[PDB]
Design a protein around this motif. Structure first.
Motif, short mmCIF file in Angstrom:
data_model
loop_
_atom_site.label_atom_id
_atom_site.label_comp_id
_atom_site.label_asym_id
_atom_site.label_seq_id
_atom_site.Cartn_x
_atom_site.Cartn_y
_atom_site.Cartn_z
N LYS A 56 0.82 -1.21 0.00
CA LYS A 56 0.00 0.00 0.00
C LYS A 56 0.84 1.25 0.00
O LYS A 56 1.70 1.44 0.85
N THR A 62 -1.58 7.28 1.81
CA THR A 62 -2.80 7.90 1.34
C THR A 62 -3.27 9.01 2.27
O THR A 62 -3.23 8.85 3.50
N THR A 71 -5.31 10.92 4.63
CA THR A 71 -6.44 11.04 5.58
C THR A 71 -7.00 12.49 5.64
O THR A 71 -6.24 13.47 5.68
N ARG A 99 -8.29 19.58 3.80
CA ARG A 99 -8.42 18.61 2.71
C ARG A 99 -9.77 18.69 2.06
O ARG A 99 -9.86 18.85 0.85
N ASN A 139 -6.48 3.39 6.14
CA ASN A 139 -5.82 2.46 7.03
C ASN A 139 -6.83 1.91 8.00
O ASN A 139 -6.93 0.70 8.16
N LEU A 176 11.85 8.93 9.38
CA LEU A 176 10.62 8.25 9.02
C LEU A 176 10.76 7.46 7.74
O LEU A 176 10.16 6.40 7.59
N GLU A 204 3.07 -1.63 4.37
CA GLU A 204 3.15 -0.24 3.89
C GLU A 204 4.31 0.48 4.56
O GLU A 204 5.01 -0.09 5.39
N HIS A 251 5.66 6.22 7.21
CA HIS A 251 5.46 7.65 6.94
C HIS A 251 4.21 7.99 6.13
O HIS A 251 3.47 7.12 5.66
N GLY A 252 3.98 9.28 5.99
CA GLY A 252 2.85 9.77 5.24
C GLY A 252 3.10 9.98 3.76
O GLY A 252 3.95 9.32 3.14
N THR A 253 2.35 10.91 3.20
CA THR A 253 2.41 11.16 1.79
C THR A 253 3.59 12.08 1.53
O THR A 253 4.02 12.24 0.37
N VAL A 254 4.12 12.66 2.61
CA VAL A 254 5.21 13.62 2.54
C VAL A 254 4.76 14.84 1.74
O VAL A 254 5.37 15.19 0.73
N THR A 255 3.69 15.49 2.21
CA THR A 255 3.11 16.66 1.53
C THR A 255 4.10 17.82 1.30
O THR A 255 4.16 18.38 0.19
N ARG A 256 4.88 18.18 2.33
CA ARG A 256 5.84 19.28 2.20
C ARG A 256 6.72 19.03 0.98
O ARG A 256 6.99 19.97 0.22
N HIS A 257 7.13 17.78 0.78
CA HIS A 257 8.00 17.43 -0.33
C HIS A 257 7.30 17.54 -1.64
O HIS A 257 7.89 17.91 -2.66
N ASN A 261 12.81 9.82 0.84
CA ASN A 261 13.33 8.49 1.09
C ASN A 261 12.36 7.39 0.65
O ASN A 261 11.28 7.19 1.24
#
Ligand SMILES: NC(=O)C1=CN([C@@H]2O[C@H](COP(=O)(O)OP(=O)(O)OC[C@H]3O[C@@H](n4cnc5c(N)ncnc54)[C@H](OP(=O)(O)O)[C@@H]3O)[C@@H](O)[C@H]2O)C=CC1
Ligand SMILES: NC(=O)C1=CN([C@@H]2O[C@H](COP(=O)(O)OP(=O)(O)OC[C@H]3O[C@@H](n4cnc5c(N)ncnc54)[C@H](OP(=O)(O)O)[C@@H]3O)[C@@H](O)[C@H]2O)C=CC1
Ligand SMILES: CN1C(=O)/C(=C\c2ccc(=O)[nH]c2)NC1=S
Lengths: 386, 390
Positions: A70, A73, A75, A80, A94, A262, A280, A283-289, A302
């Motif tokens: 997975k 994704t 949340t 949002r 999740n 992370l 999975e 970590h998250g979606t890494v929005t800042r990135h 990463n």
């Protein structure tokens, strides 16, 4: 000329991980493996489009085919809902999946020899596995919690607290033996699969009876299914207490299952029956990135967690199918990733663990595509040779 | 000549912390501060002797004089009873004292620049308040667990099913919380924020336990608005509820410098804060340090860390000063706090810190001073620091 993988449910994701995910399949998985792939688009606009159906649909797929990997994704919250014009504040995927699948979640940080660990070392990773009516009490009076058995043989009533002060708040929690049992099976099998010792840790002295029952039902399942298979690999189970844990553990070689950066943490939900598994990233979606990516800026994200999601998943499909070829492959990649980082080639986050952020010169690390490129090169080689 | 300190309640503890506390007094407080000292010896022998009386009294003292400083005390268990032939396995002093003064316990870790931290983003300190008495028991087989509220005013009782066990047995537990207790938590919490000029954060699992953590959040706002918003904005700080998942996020991504309300050990300071915001009890968060103490007994060289203990004295002394408008004391307390940090930030430290930097296996003796040496260096820099502010 390519490996037959078999049945894998994959789940697409969101933002920066949606990109890495694709990059992985393209550079690292598909050039090497043929899969009968049950892909599910779990990205936010598609979930909304279908009324979170894709999610339920996916979860059922994993239940069916035993293996799910997975992508991270989104949340949803207010911002949002506002951002994508969501129709609803969809429940975390999740959450939805976990709910349809059960099992218990194991979290393992991937260890690189040139990357600071909290304890100096720690050569081998510790694998962590984590495991109500509430109301208002208008005024004074007794809150008692009371147990009558089915046969009416007795009645036990314990007083929770007597309110003479004023009002307050009160709650009641339970836990069936079954669920503890599922937590145990999963816990021992985990220790088996990774050929490592298992530990348990509890309150036991404070919440005596509650955390007591855990001590017990573990022992029992050990002494009647596992004491045997375990020593058949020179490997024990044992109990312990939280502070006596952190004791002999924060002075340890590491590399056991313990039940309760992370880009390097890998979660896996291991179902009761031992056959079903979903991997999975942690970590998250890494929005800042991803915001940066969108802006045309360079990124250093990463891919390791996400990679290990794949390998651990593939690893478990191989195991199930009795597929030595595939099993080899998953392992080979898990190697190449650690190898490549230990070789000195790595993303900015890792570079910061080594040197500290104020100290990172662009030429200490590689960008997202450069690192992914490099693993592609090193995987290609490592496979060609052995 | 020395600074006039005022009423301070002293409690003496056990083992290594006892040895150190005497050095702190001798070398660091007394030379510069006179104090109307209500001392109480909370040694284990003396607690035994007096039938844990000395404990009670000490608490009552703190009640009356608003300021306490506690040395780490042995909490007994079976092993301890044997060692000391105790008449009884007496309850934890803190337990006794805390159940007489009430209030909220607050840990702050003391940060030196040269010390590898938990997160390097935490350049400023993070202070954590915590709120135990839950009844738990084992369901042996099927049956109903119910939790019932009978009003004391004779109104119809109220029954919640907790779970009906059909397939098997398991476990169950009631938990409770009084409004008073939460009100107290809130006050103590706003007291401490203003005290330290940092902002305040309350976390819960409020979404998940609508009614239980619901009460907290509320009781906190209701108190915050009724009597602190004024003082808070009039100091450029704010209060704010958050959920644990948001809360660790913002925390791990922050500069530090905030107090959080939550529902190495020689650098950890515990502070009991009574709601009235008038009484405080200071103490190091660590224990009596037996391991080190038995080394000291057998003639061997120790390197135990006094900072934690020293800050007990200083927050206590600082609070005293703030109460009495004692500008002279106020300075001193700070002056000493700094000298502490400074000395370590200058290379001079104990083995445990030296191992934070060099790694426990790589620690060589010449990296650190032993208890008595380090204590001297504190004494030295204090004198010098103090001489400078004149
Ligand atoms: N579906 C899932 O399994 C999960 C989804 N999420 C979702 O993630 C979204 C936003 O994530 P958020 O909670 O802000 O933070 P994330 O967990 O996505 O990551 C936040 C920060 O952690 C660092 N980081 C995490 N992963 C990596 C990586 N692979 N490589 C490099 N750095 C990394 C980066 O730090 P820096 O800023 O210092 O670069 C990043 O900015 C939310 O919408 C949330 O719902 C979150 C967790 C799990
Ligand atoms: N009254 C109170 O507030 C408290 C009392 N106690 C009491 O202490 C007794 C034994 O305590 P214990 O469990 O050993 O816990 P301690 O807090 O005394 O410390 C255990 C270990 O932590 C490290 N450590 C703690 N403090 C220091 C320091 N000041 N300088 C250097 N290292 C330190 C040492 O580890 P290392 O050996 O690796 O150097 C020490 O052996 C018990 O009877 C207990 O009830 C415990 C906690 C609080
Ligand atoms: C510091 N400390 C404690 O607080 C303790 C037990 C305790 C404390 C408060 C209370 O109300 N009941 C029990 N043991 C040690 S050591």
């Amino acid at each position: 000329k390519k490996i037959s993988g078999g049945s894998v449910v994959e789940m697409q994701g969101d933002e920066m991980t949606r990109i890495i995910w694709e990059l992985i399949k393209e550079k690292l998985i598909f050039p090497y493996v043929e899969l009968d792939l049950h892909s599910y688009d779990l990205g936010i606009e598609n979930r909304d489009a279908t009324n979170d159906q894709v999610t339920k649909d996916a979860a059922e797929a994993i239940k069916k085919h035993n293996v799910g990997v997975k992508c991270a994704t989104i949340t949803p919250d207010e911002k949002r809902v506002e951002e994508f014009k969501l129709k609803q504040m969809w429940k975390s995927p999740n959450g939805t999946i976990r709910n349809i699948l059960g099992g218990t979640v194991f979290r393992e940080a991937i260890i690189c020899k040139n990357i600071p660990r909290l304890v100096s070392g720690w050569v081998k990773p510790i694998i962590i596995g984590h495991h109500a009516t509430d109301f208002v009490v208008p005024g004074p009076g007794k809150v008692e919690i009371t147990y009558t058995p089915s046969d009416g043989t007795q009645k036990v009533t314990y007083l929770v607290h007597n309110f003479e002060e004023g009002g307050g708040v009160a709650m009641g929690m339970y836990n069936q033996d079954k669920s503890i049992e599922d937590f145990a099976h999963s816990s021992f099998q985990m220790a088996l699969s990774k050929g490592w010792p298992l530990y348990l840790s509890t309150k036991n002295t404070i919440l005596k009876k509650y955390d007591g029952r855990f001590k017990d039902i573990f022992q029992e399942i050990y002494d009647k299914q596992y004491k045997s298979q375990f020593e058949a690999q020179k490997i024990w189970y044992e109990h312990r207490l939280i502070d006596d844990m952190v004791a002999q553990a924060m002075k340890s070689e590491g590399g056991f299952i313990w039940a309760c950066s992370l880009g390097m943490m890998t979660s896996v939900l291991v179902c009761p029956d031992g056959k079903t598994v979903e991997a999975e990233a942690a970590h998250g979606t890494v929005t800042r990135h991803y915001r940066m990516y969108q802006k045309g800026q360079e990124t250093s994200t990463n891919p390791i967690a996400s990679i290990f999601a794949w390998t651990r998943g593939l690893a478990h499909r191989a195991k199930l199918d009795n597929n030595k070829e595939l099993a080899f492959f998953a392992n080979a990649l898990e190697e190449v990733s650690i190898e490549t980082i230990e070789a000195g080639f790595m993303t900015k986050d890792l570079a910061a663990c080594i040197k500290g952020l104020p100290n990172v010169q662009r030429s200490d690390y590689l960008n997202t595509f450069e690192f992914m490129d490099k693993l592609g090169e090193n995987l290609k080689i490592k496979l060609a040779q052995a």
